Amino acid sequence: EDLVEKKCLAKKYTHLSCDKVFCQPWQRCIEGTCVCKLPYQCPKNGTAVCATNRRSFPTYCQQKSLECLHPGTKFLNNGTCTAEGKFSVSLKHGNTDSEGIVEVKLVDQDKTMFICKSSWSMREANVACLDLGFQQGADTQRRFKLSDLSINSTECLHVHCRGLETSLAECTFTKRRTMGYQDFADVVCYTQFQCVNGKYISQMKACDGINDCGDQSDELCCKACQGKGFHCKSGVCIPSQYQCNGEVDCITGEDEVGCAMDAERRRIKSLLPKLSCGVDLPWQVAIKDASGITCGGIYIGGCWILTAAHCLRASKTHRYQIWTVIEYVDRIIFHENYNAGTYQNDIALIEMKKDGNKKDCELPRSIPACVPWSPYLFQPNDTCIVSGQWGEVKLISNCSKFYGNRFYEKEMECAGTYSGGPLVCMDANNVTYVWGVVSWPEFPGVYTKVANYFDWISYHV
Ligand SMILES: *[C@@H]1O[C@H](CO)[C@@H](O)[C@H](O)[C@H]1NC(C)=O
Numbered sequence: 493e494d495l496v497e498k499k500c501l502a503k504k505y506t507h508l509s510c511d512k513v514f515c516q517p518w519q520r521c522i523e524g525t526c527v528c529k530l531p532y533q534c535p536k537n538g539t540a541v542c543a544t545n546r547r548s549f550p551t552y553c554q555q556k557s558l559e560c561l562h563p564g565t566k567f568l569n570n571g572t573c574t575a576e577g578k579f580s581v582s583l584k585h586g587n588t589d590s591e592g593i594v595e596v597k598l599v600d601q602d603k604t605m606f607i608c609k610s611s612w613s614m615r616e617a618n619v620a621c622l623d624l625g626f627q628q629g630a631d632t633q634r635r636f637k638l639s640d641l642s643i644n645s646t647e648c649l650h651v652h653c654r655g656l657e658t659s660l661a662e663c664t665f666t667k668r669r670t671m672g673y674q675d676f677a678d679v680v681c682y683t684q685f686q687c688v689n690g691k692y693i694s695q696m697k698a699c700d701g702i703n704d705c706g707d708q709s710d711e712l713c714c715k716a717c718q719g720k721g722f723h724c725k726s727g728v729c730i731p732s733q734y735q736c737n738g739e740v741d742c743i744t745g746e747d748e749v750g751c752a753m754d755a756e757r758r759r760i761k762s763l764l765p766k767l768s769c770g771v772d773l774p775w776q777v778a779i780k781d782a783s784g785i786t787c788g789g790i791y792i793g794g795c796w797i798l799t800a801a802h803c804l805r806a807s808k809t810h811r812y813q814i815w816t817v818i819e820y821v822d823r824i825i826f827h828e829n830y831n832a833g834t835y836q837n838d839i840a841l842i843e844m845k846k847d848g849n850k851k852d853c854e855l856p857r858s859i860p861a862c863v864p865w866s867p868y869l870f871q872p873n874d875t876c877i878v879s880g881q882w883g884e885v886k887l888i889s890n891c892s893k894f895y896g897n898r899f900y901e902k903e904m905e906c907a908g909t910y911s912g913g914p915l916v917c918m919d920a921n922n923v924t925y926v927w928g929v930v931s932w933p934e935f936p937g938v939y940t941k942v943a944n945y946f947d948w949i950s951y952h953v
Pocket residue numbers: 536537
């Protein structure tokens with residue numbers, strides 16, 4: 493069984509990696525990695541929450557964003573802080589400090605109860621160990637087996653966590669009617685497939701939909717899921733029940749297409765301002781010079797047009813006009829590491845003069861295409877619309893077979909048929925993405941892969 497890919501594992505993508513996953517609403521994507529946004533950037537609408545330092549926060553986002561920025565400050569309770577209320581988890585009846593039967597003291601309830609093992613998974617186990625100090629979550633191979641004793645009472649606490657929470661306080665608890673025997677949730681916290689955090693687990697746990705690692709190493713590099721997990725085209729697995737649950741989990745977005753405090757974070761997403769991108773060829777532009785040689789531009793937003801370098805620098809005059817309506821081009825920025833012969837980094841930004849002398853560059857009625865932030869959005873055998881009429885090309889795999897060392901897989905994309913023009917692709921929700929630009933049967937078109945230039949794009953845009 494060869495579910496896991498090896499070539500990713502060098503780059504070690506955790507849940508903090510944009511390219512493979514969505515940043516939590518108290519975070520912002522910057523250079524492929526989830527960073528903290530300041531509390532005053534969170535959506536205003538939310539109910540108050542309590543942090544372990546007895547401090548109260550208007551929104552749940554704002555708390556989690558302070559915890560993000562300022563370690564130590566954990567979560568405690570929904571609603572304002574009580575004076576007496578204080579949360580506690582503990583491992584009792586155990587031969588060592590990093591193991592036992594889990595005991596929870598629910599901030600409000602003065603009574604102390606145990607957890608039931610019939611619903612106890614790695615999602616809860618990891619979260620438990622994480623607030624217990626052990627930063628690598630629960631052990632997956634090891635156990636703590638009991639032999640009766642303290643199995644008198646009928647008490648129990650069913651728990652459920654997403655799995656990435658930094659405290660059991662954040663999870664949802666519900667008292668259940670316990671059967672037997674035996675039903676008490678044990679755990680072994682990890683004290684020394686490898687995870688990015690440093691945790692070894694067996695290969696059978698890798699790529700099954702379940703976060704065994706704690707930071708999602710075992711799930712982000714998957715050609716196909718093991719058990720019930722659902723394979724995102726992006727190469728990631730998600731729990732089957734993550735299908736049609738009102739949250740776009742896969743960066744590709746396919747789990748929510750074709751459908752007819754965990755609940756609080758989902759709520760916080762649906763209020764974030766979504767990008768207005770890629771609504772015959774509205775994005776299509778044509779960069780004509782006064783000489784008479786044309787390039788196939790693609791409108792991405794506002795003042796900006798994206799094209800290939802070589803065609804622009806074919807002009808002697810260095811003065812253009814953008815046709816689609818006629819705008820003028822103020823300045824042009826080529827990528828600094830453009831290599832003429834190899835065509836690596838064959839990409840350039842055009843900045844329009846705007847004109848009007850009163851407002852902004854944007855055209856009254858023009859739709860910008862979407863710029864891919866991840867190189868895992870579109871994959872082989874995906875269909876894409878080439879233009880320069882328009883031809884439906886397909887993305888081809890293993891392009892070393894055709895060109896070898898003239899094709900640099902990180903910086904270039906090959907589209908097999910079935911200047912500087914666009915290679916536009918659409919996802920399941922009808923979002924038009926500018927996937928590639930035209931760069932240079934057994935000769936498939938080669939395209940500079942734009943997703944690998946989102947940081948670069950961003951720097952100027
Ligand atoms: C929440 O949003 C509504 C509009 O949907 C708005 O009327 C209200 O003022 C917002 N809440 C706060 C606390 O500002």
